[PDB]
Amino acid sequence: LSELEKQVAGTLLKLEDTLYISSVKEIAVDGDKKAAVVYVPYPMLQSFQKNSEALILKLEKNHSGHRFIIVANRTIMKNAYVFTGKKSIRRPRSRTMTSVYNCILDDICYPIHVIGKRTLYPAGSNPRLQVVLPKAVYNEVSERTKTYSAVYKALTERDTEFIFM
RNA sequence: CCGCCGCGUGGGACCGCGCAGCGGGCGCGGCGCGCCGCGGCAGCCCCGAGGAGAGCGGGCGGGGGCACCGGUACCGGCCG
Predict the structure, then answer these.
(1) How far is the CA of A105 from the C1' of B10 (A)?
(2) Which terms does the record give in the GO molecular function aspect (predicted)?
């Protein structure tokens, strides 16, 4: 129940000539441009991912003022086992904190595959992570690395920086 | 203050175990044993160790066992 969903859904209906989204979150960057995330339901992520690049481009052209990102919504449980007193319940490994963050990272920029991750530990600076991307693509995603870092920090408290190799 | 391998509280990093879905209504204050929509859940597999094992292809080798088999030489005998 927000204004943005209404016009983005209007655009959605204006694309084809079935699939619905859960919610939307926008976050600003250092520049006046913001980035909007779409919390897609988990099962329909792959169906949205067949040609997500086209959808994001058409949405950007339809409604400017901020970039459109599409991601799934995953839950996190905070206990490996559960002691009901009678039987012990195992938490599946897919619901851990670490798996969700990595999947989020891969989803933020699915069309361009990540070729490596590295975390650096400076002497005093808060430890930070730098990823590695192909040189085949750069100017395609060079202009939108700051937004990627900002959204990663927003969703995950962990920070990051982007490079190419 | 000092003879405790036992008792209680907390911490919970390190050290090792946790196979058998959950949520709600019938359902009594609670806990059980059952009946009900799956109609509430992202329902239900870390990765795959310059650890180990199995598999395919390649050649490599006085590696092993069985049968068969040639060559002079030592020895003995015989013709001259």
Answers:
(1) 39
(2) structural constituent of ribosome
